[PDB]
């Protein structure tokens, strides 16, 4: 299978007042898109909004 | 263990789906 570039983001354990685990500790594996996985958006003039 | 589903032991009892509740 072709390889994919990924990021391991640390994830610390978090518990609520009930003392029950809600976010397990470990790493979050996030898939990073390649160059060809993106798309080009059409050019659009930027119009600001008044306060 | 507190907050444990009676129907399925080993899985925490998910709260009922409420939806959008404006403050």
């Amino acid at each position: 299978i072709p390889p994919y570039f990924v990021a391991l983001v640390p994830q610390e354990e978090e518990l609520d007042d009930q003392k029950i685990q809600v976010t397990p500790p470990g790493f979050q594996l996030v898939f990073l898109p390649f160059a060809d996985d993106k798309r080009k958006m059409p050019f659009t003039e930027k119009i600001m909004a008044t306060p | 263990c507190p907050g444990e589903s009676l129907i399925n032991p080993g899985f925490k009892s998910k709260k009922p789906a409420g939806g959008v509740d404006f403050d």
Partner: protein
Amino acid sequence: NKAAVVLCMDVGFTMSNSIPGIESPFEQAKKVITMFVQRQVFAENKDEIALVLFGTDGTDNPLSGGDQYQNITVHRHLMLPDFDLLEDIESKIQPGSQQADFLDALIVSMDVIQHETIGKKFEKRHIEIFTDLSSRFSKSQLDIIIHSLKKCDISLQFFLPFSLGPFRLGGHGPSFPLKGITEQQKEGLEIVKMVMISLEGEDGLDEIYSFSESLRKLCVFKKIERHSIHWPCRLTIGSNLSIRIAAYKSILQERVKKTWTVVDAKTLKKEDIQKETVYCLNDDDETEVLKEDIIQGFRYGSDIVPFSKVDEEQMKYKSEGKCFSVLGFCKSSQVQRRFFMGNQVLKVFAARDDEAAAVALSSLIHALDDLDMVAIVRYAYDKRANPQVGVAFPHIKHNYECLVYVQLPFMEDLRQYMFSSLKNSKKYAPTEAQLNAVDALIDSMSLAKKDEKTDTLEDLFPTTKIPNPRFQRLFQCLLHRALHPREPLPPIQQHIWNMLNPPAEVTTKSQIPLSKIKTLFPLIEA
């Protein structure tokens, strides 16, 4: 939407000068052009490609009137690329024994673009030049060149052996060290910079790439790539407020458009092989049942409940399709990236051409950004599409602003798993020396660098800009099989590995901390 691309290439003696330890510029330019042609051909793109070589011994250009525009040959005219072009690039194109400037070659390329594109309609015209800038040239025709380029709406791109110890192609490092550049090369670079500034302003500087850099950037197709279609809808914040919007697929995984067809070994035809599916009962006789005598059913815990397709369609959930409604607004901190779902990211802008919708969308985006909020919304592509709940958050840039939409999970889409804690374990607790070793390893393997007194991180390994290697590998293998039917597939190209690997500096710095970690941490397989 078609396009015309004229590839201008130097084949002079200087291009063949292979400095020891560094690949010659001729080979790098050949590789870049081969990659471009492979992408254009194997993608079945309706793009016209022509090839002009300047520096050849002969002269085969329309401007060869007298002793001007010599040593320039139009190798291929403006016609659809085929395996013939790839074969000519690979084998029957050798460096010339004469040196020619790139200005007459560029004039010849413009003349080809003008003359050939007379009976056809092309939305974009592009010219790419691969040169070393190591030849004498005259500036007498620079102004006319710029005027013609501006009038004819022709884009320009330059590729040079050097960008603006060991050397690796596409290795995320310095291709040509800045020690040995000739004065003529500096003059050519300055002229190219002047031309680019005079054409696209300051933005033209970024369009001067290098062969090694271009091999892992996908820049060659930047000016010919087609825009995605727009999905029009109406963002709804209530029952009387609606904003016309258009959504595009900003990020979507790219797959292979071409499939594989099963063919017979003896004869390479798909019509001699037939695939059929049959249904049989649970009897020793293997009784056959027609498709019309089949009913859909579902399992209900050891009990089979028949459920016909018509009944399912009648009783399936029904909703009004093509809806983009805002369920509510919630603090951005309440939405976490780890919960993102789906396989696409949507970018929502205002309608095609209307100031009112643009103003409304800008107001909403600015309000969300200032208040640190995101919109929980309901998304449905059409009537058939299953409705989904997603999060839309503002995305403001110096040149454009929009709403980025990503799907969110449902209650049953979340898996509740229990994992043992690691911070309160007396058996897996690391020691101070182990923590110091890990810290040293992390410090020695940083892919981001701090710039000089400006507080701007620079990425050393921007994997987001690297093309998917699978497409290049498939194209190279297909071309090798086509041109060499009686040979096995070749190994993976070195530059692919170089671009898929981090800079050698990171490894060199990390050698020591890795050894320290190995010594400190005992690891034994079970």
